């Protein structure tokens, strides 16, 4: 008999290294991963994206249907040109936060 509350933040997820380009704005729960907002994003129709169960966990290689080819990678970030420092099973933005997807090759 007594009540929880939980915050429900907004993630702006965005893709510049695509025709077309994606941007769109994705509500969850304060805590959610970045997988769970690419999730959220293709639960809302018009976003897809692939990963491969590697032994540091899941890694992202296709986004709308680009899959990363040899010697490039789906680099994650925030704004302002901030690269993430874990991946899609452990960084939790934050409200207001931009988390951009970008091709990147090295
Ligand atoms: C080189 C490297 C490294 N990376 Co990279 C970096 N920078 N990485 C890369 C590259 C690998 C290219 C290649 N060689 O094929 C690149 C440059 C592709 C890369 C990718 C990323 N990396 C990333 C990160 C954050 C990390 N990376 C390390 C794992 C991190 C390593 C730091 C370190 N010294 O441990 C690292 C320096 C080298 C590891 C290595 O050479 N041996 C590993 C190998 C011997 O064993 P393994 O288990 O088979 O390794 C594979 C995986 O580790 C995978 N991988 C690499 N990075 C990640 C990150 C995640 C989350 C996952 C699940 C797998 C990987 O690639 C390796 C080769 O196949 C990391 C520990 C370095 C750090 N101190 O932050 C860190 C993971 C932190 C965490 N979550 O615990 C990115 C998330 C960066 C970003 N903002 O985009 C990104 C992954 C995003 C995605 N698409 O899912």
């Known amino acids: ?5 939980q915050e429900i933040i907004s ?4 893709v510049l290294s695509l025709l077309p380009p994606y941007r769109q704005s ?3 729960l304060a805590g959610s991963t970045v997988e769970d907002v690419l ?9 897809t994206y692939e990963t491969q169960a590697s032994l540091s966990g899941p890694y992202l290689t296709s986004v709308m249907g680009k899959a990363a080819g040899e010697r490039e990678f789906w680099q994650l970030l925030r704004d302002p040109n901030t690269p993430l420092l ?11 936060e931009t988390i951009e997807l970008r091709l990147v090759s090295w």
């Open 1 to 5: 008999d007594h009540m929880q509350t």
């Open 11 to 14: 993630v702006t997820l965005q």
């Open 26 to 28: 994705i509500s969850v």
């Open 39 to 47: 999730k959220k994003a293709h639960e809302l129709g018009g976003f």
């Open 86 to 96: 874990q991946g899609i099973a452990d960084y939790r933005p934050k409200d207001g």
